[PDB]
Amino acid sequence: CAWIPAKPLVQGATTAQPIPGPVPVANGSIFQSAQPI
Amino acid sequence: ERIRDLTSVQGVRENSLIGYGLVVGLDGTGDQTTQTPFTTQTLNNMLSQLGITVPTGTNMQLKNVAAVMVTASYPPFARQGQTIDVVVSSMGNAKSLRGGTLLMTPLKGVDSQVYALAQGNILVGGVNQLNGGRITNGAIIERELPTQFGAGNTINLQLNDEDFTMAQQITDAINRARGYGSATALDARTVQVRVPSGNSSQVRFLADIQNMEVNVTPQDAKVVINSRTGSVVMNREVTLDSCAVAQGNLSVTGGSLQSVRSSANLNSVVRALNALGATPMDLMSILQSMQSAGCLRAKLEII
Amino acid sequence: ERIRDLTSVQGVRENSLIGYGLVVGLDGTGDQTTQTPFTTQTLNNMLSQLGITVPTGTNMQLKNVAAVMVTASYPPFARQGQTIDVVVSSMGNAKSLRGGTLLMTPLKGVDSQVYALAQGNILVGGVNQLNGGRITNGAIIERELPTQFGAGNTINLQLNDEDFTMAQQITDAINRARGYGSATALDARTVQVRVPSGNSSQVRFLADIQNMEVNVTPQDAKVVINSRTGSVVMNREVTLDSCAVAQGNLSVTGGSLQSVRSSANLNSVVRALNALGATPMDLMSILQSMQSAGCLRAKLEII
Amino acid sequence: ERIRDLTSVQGVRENSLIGYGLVVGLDGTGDQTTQTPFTTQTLNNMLSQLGITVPTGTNMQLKNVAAVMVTASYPPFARQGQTIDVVVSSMGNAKSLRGGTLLMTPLKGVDSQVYALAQGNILVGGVNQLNGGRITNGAIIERELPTQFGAGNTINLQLNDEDFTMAQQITDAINRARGYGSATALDARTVQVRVPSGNSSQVRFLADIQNMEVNVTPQDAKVVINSRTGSVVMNREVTLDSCAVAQGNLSVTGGSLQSVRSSANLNSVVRALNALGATPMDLMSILQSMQSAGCLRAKLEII
Amino acid sequence: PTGTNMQLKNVAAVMVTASYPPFARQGQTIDVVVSSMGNAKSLRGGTLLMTPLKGVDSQVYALAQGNILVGG
Amino acid sequence: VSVTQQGQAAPVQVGQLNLTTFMNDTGLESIGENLYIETQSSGAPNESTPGL
């Protein structure tokens, strides 16, 4: 009964890896913005 | 020596650096440290870094230490070892920073990276501001920014003020001085200049371009009004149209309606407006009403 | 003797050293030690190091001891045994350091390593700051920094102020003095110089370069305004454009609108602005309004 | 007699010694010993060493004893039996050390080893500091430091101030006086000198080198500002550029904007700045603003 | 720490307004207006810290930092 | 000064309240709110454990 395989309520991965940031542009500014949405 | 005063070079820009620090050596005019817990917290952090561990439960009431924020400008083409000026501003309930000293302060950029280290003695005027000071050569540059200068054959001169006429004048001056297709105009603010490939050649080209003389064409008529400081400034292009003006406690030097003549140059405008006998605060309302009516042939900007 | 005043040599830079110490010998003007537990804690640490163990539960109320922070500058090419000046600043609720003595203080770098040891007598002016002092030759250098000077055939002169014209002038002067390809320009701030391999040869080259004379080309027009100290400074490149100015309680010496003539040099600008009869605090607002309008042909920087 | 005033010899350096002691013979101006338990603890230690055991539970309220810290300098090539001066500074709540006597005090080094023993009578000025004093020949040297002097054929002269020109001048003077390859320059601060192997020969070489005369080349322009003491010092290399200066309550001797002429030497700079009629505290702000603008062609250092 | 009483006197929360010019390019400088927001008494000798200037689309178009000039 | 803590079966010692004794008690200068400052006629405050 308790050994029957079941699908959990929250399926899939429960964590996400951070994506490394974009390469900064060689313009002489410290402020670098990611691709805006 | 006018092009260097009218434009800026693309990629040659300044950045802003910020940081937190402690200022010591005050004559009992520092933080109260009872309403500013971060002062004592960061002093304990510094002492722990230096090897002294003050027990967590202890009352520390200082008088010669103030928590301050340090601001600096990262110059173009900054190199490590170079020194820059910094501004030191108190953050909470401090009374003065007259003879203080700024301890080791890392100056972070927008990307939260250390670009300079600040440490020095504050100079405070002493009617004068007591909670703000400046340290000349107070910060040493520690990081360098990559740049694209010297790469490619195109560099953009960016005008401080947008003007198609001024852009065309700068383009024509560069073409008159350094060949046919040396400079082209992209918009009212940007002039594209062709330069030889390399670093030294582009420096030579920019050195010749920067000190060039360009005759400034007449700008747009503009009247700047500052109500917070109570000032009015009119440039040389302001003209007037004939119309009648009335305002409280102002009369002909007689009737309350005073004629204002049609004026072509700035001297005529000044004479016509001084004939009104108006205080500058009254002149602000008069000018706004005349702009609404249409006598003032200028752009009225309130700053 | 101008190149040494306009540039700095790459790798020849100064570092900052910080440390903690105790100042003794005060005339009852030291820490209260009830609001500054670290003073008594570090005094007990010093006594324990010297062989005296004060019991943990004991009330110590001192009057001749102050906890201080010591700041110093690590010079270029510093060698052990050399002496440097230090600044001593009180940290909490101390009243004066007039006749104090600084005990053995290790001066740490950014990497938290001891580079100098500080000990000496403080000199305090005595309107004068009482919680800050200076000790000449107060710290002896203990560690030396490795450097790359003498290696390679390239050394960079870094200009204090970025300028393509000044960089080109320095490059041309070096090329005019010491051969064709002796110096090249990399950007508005850096000039690369070719030197022979070795240590003595590079010292000779730098000795010849440093005292060279370079005629300074005209910089950018700039008006520096310090509102905290109430000062205005205008360089020789500032010009004016004709326009009308009005401000509170200022009038023609008559009407509130005063004409300002077109000015080419600095003497004309000074005469035109003095004709306004403006206090420097009023002159600050006037200058900002004129920069907004466009009469002021200069870069207005508030410091 | 200039080389000895411009450089220091490698290995010929001074160290710092510290120690703890008791000062007796005061006229009721010693420690209260109720807020300073270490005074009574160390007095009991001394009595126990001398053969007197005071019971642990006993109230000792002294008035003629003060706990003091003793500082001294270990000279180069110090030998046991030699005497040095010491500084004696009170540590807690003592009132005066006017006629006190310092008991046997071991002076420890950084390595916590005894290098001298201090005992003598304090001289206190008596506006004068009362809690600090000096004892001439107050400490006898007990330990000697090994050194490498006399070994090898190389000795380094270390300049007090870094300068490529001064290093080259010293090298050229030594080469002009004592053969072709007698001295070489390693960096802006160090000059390497070849000496014969041995002790007496190197002493002779250093004796000839030390009193040599070297013409000092002009240094970097520098303006030193001390806000804590209210002083300004300008060296002979400071020049000025023409520009306008305005500051509160300062006017033409007229308008608030005063012209400052281009100045080449120091006398011209002094005349131009005295024409402003500025108090030194006002002169500090004026100089900082002019450095920001660019008129001041000097390095502004706040100490 | 979250539970702590902070009573400051030298800090004021301000709103910064600016104009984005035609054909504006990165690296160019513009003037800003700084206005207090609540129960502050004066901003005579203050300094504006790093302030991102957003547009209508809530995107950063400029960064503001400098010394304020107040008539007085 | 001892304080009892819950669970702990032994009081914890916090501190000793020390009494100050003067050799001339009448010469103290009354500040007002039930406080006395030492005076040249009542100098040398002796801090002692109470009872000794």
Query: What is the DSSP code string of chain D?
Result: --HHHHEEETT---EEEEEEEEEE--SS-S--SSS-HHHHHHHHHHHHHHT----SS-----SSEEEEEEEEEEPTT--TT-EEEEEEEE-SS----TT-EEEEEEEE-TTS-EEEEEEEE-B------SSEEEEEEEEEE-------TTSSSEEEEEESS--HHHHHHHHHHHHHHH-TTSEEE-SSSEEEEE--SSSHHHHHHHHHHHT---PPPP---EEEEETTTTEEEE-TT-EE--EEEEETT------S-EEE--B-SHHHHHHHHHTTT--HHHHHHHHHHHHHHT-EESEEEE-
Nearest residue to C291 (alpha-carbon basis) of C232, C230, C229: C232
Token pair belonging to C172: 């041309």
Rg of chain D over all Cα atoms, to the nearest angstrom: 28
Q: Would you call A28 and B11 a contact, using CB atoms and an 8 Å cutoff? A: yes
Which residues have a Cβ under 8 Å from the Cβ of B116 and sit 6 or more positions away? Answer: B17, B72, B74, B84, B106, B107, B139, B140, B141, B142, B143
The answer to whether B280 and C248 are in contact (CB under 8 A) is: yes
Round to whole Å and give the CA distance between B302 and C20.
53
Amino acid at C235: N
End-to-end CA distance of chain F: 17
Round to whole Å and give the CA distance between F4 and F1.
10
Nearest residue to C272 (alpha-carbon basis) of C226, C225, C235, C239: C239
Round to whole Å and give the CA distance between B155 and B203.
11
- Residues in chain D within 8 Å Cβ distance of F52: 59
Nearest residue to D149 (alpha-carbon basis) of D12, D7, D16: D12
Q: Would you call B146 and A30 a contact, using CB atoms and an 8 Å cutoff? A: no
Q: Is residue B105 within a helix (H) or strand (E), and if so which, with residue range?
A: strand B101-108
Which residues have a Cβ under 8 Å from the Cβ of C18 and sit 6 or more positions away? Answer: B50, B103, B104, B119, C69, C70, C71, C72, C107, C108
Looking only at the bridges linking them, the beta strands covering C299-302 and D132-141 are: unpaired
The answer to whether B54 and B60 are in contact (CB under 8 A) is: yes
End-to-end CA distance of chain C: 30
Q: Would you call B85 and D228 a contact, using CB atoms and an 8 Å cutoff? A: no
Mutate to test the interface with E, among A31, A35, A37 (most CBs of E within 10 A): A31
- Residues in chain E within 8 Å Cβ distance of C285: 69, 71
Q: Would you call C227 and E69 a contact, using CB atoms and an 8 Å cutoff? A: yes
DSSP label of C123: B
- Residues in chain A within 8 Å Cβ distance of B146: 26
The answer to whether C78 and C144 are in contact (CB under 8 A) is: yes
- Residues in chain A within 8 Å Cβ distance of E59: 36
The answer to whether B126 and B98 are in contact (CB under 8 A) is: yes
Residue in B62, B82, B206 closest to C93 by CB: B62
Q: Would you call E26 and A29 a contact, using CB atoms and an 8 Å cutoff? A: yes
Round to whole Å and give the CA distance between C228 and B229.
17
Count of C-beta atoms within a 10 Å radius of residue D270? 14
Mutate to test the interface with E, among C222, C227, C299 (most CBs of E within 10 A): C227
The answer to whether B82 and B142 are in contact (CB under 8 A) is: no
The answer to whether B207 and C164 are in contact (CB under 8 A) is: yes
Deposited experimental method: cryo-EM
The answer to whether B71 and B17 are in contact (CB under 8 A) is: yes
The answer to whether D94 and D131 are in contact (CB under 8 A) is: yes
Round to whole Å and give the CA distance between B70 and B140.
13
Residues in chain A: 37
Q: Hey, which residues does D15 pair with through a beta bridge?
A: D74
C-alpha angle F38/F43/F44, rounded to 5°? Answer: 110
Which residues have a Cβ under 8 Å from the Cβ of D53 and sit 6 or more positions away? Answer: D47
Give D302 to chain B, closest Cα distance, Å. Answer: 6
Residues in chain D: 303
C-alpha angle B116/B20/E68, rounded to 5°? Answer: 90
Q: Would you call C281 and E72 a contact, using CB atoms and an 8 Å cutoff? A: yes
- Residue keyed to tokens 């800026």: B8
Q: Which residue of E has its CA nearest to A30?
A: E27
Q: Which residue of E has its CA nearest to A29?
A: E27
Round to whole Å and give the CA distance between D64 and B166.
86
SS3 category, C42: helix
B262 vs B273, B287, F27, CA distance in Å?
11, 15, 91
Rg of chain A over all Cα atoms, to the nearest angstrom: 21
Q: Is residue C289 within a helix (H) or strand (E), and if so which, with residue range?
A: helix C280-293
Nearest residue to D278 (alpha-carbon basis) of C128, B129, D270: D270
Count B/C contacts: CB-CB distance under 8 Å: 275
Round to whole Å and give the CA distance between D100 and A17.
73
Round to whole Å and give the CA distance between E68 and E40.
15
Token pair belonging to D259: 């012209």
End-to-end CA distance of chain D: 30
Round to whole Å and give the CA distance between E55 and E46.
25
The answer to whether B49 and C20 are in contact (CB under 8 A) is: no
Round to whole Å and give the CA distance between C247 and C225.
18
Round to whole Å and give the CA distance between B225 and C301.
20
Round to whole Å and give the CA distance between D293 and B164.
31
Chains B and A touch (3+ CB pairs under 8 A): yes
Q: Would you call E67 and C284 a contact, using CB atoms and an 8 Å cutoff? A: no
D242 vs C267, D11, D263, CA distance in Å?
10, 49, 8
Q: Is residue C284 within a helix (H) or strand (E), and if so which, with residue range?
A: helix C280-293
Residue in D10, D160, D228 closest to C128 by CB: D228
Token pair belonging to D178: 């004592």
Secondary-structure percent of chain F, ordered helix, strand, coil, rounded to 5: 0, 25, 75
DSSP C142-203: -------TTSSSEEEEEESS--HHHHHHHHHHHHHHH-TTSEEE-SSSEEEEE--SSSHHHH
SS3 category, B43: helix
Round to whole Å and give the CA distance between B65 and B32.
9
Q: Hey, which residues does F48 pair with through a beta bridge?
A: F19
The answer to whether B139 and B132 are in contact (CB under 8 A) is: no
End-to-end CA distance of chain A: 49
Chains F and B touch (3+ CB pairs under 8 A): no
Chains A and E touch (3+ CB pairs under 8 A): yes
Residues in chain E: 72
The region, left, alpha or beta by phi > 0 then psi within -120 to 50, assigned to residue E9 is alpha
Q: Which residue of B has its CA nearest to C185?
A: B200
Neighbors of chain C by Cβ distance (3+ pairs < 8 Å): B, D, E
Q: Would you call E10 and B158 a contact, using CB atoms and an 8 Å cutoff? A: no
The region, left, alpha or beta by phi > 0 then psi within -120 to 50, assigned to residue B90 is beta
Round to whole Å and give the CA distance between C185 and D229.
43
Round to whole Å and give the CA distance between B27 and C264.
48
DSSP label of C263: B
Q: Phi/psi at B269 (nearest 5 deg)?
A: -65, -45
Q: Hey, which residues does B184 pair with through a beta bridge?
A: B192
Token pair belonging to D64: 């003629």
- Residues in chain F within 8 Å Cβ distance of D61: 44, 46
Which residues have a Cβ under 8 Å from the Cβ of F8 and sit 6 or more positions away? Answer: none
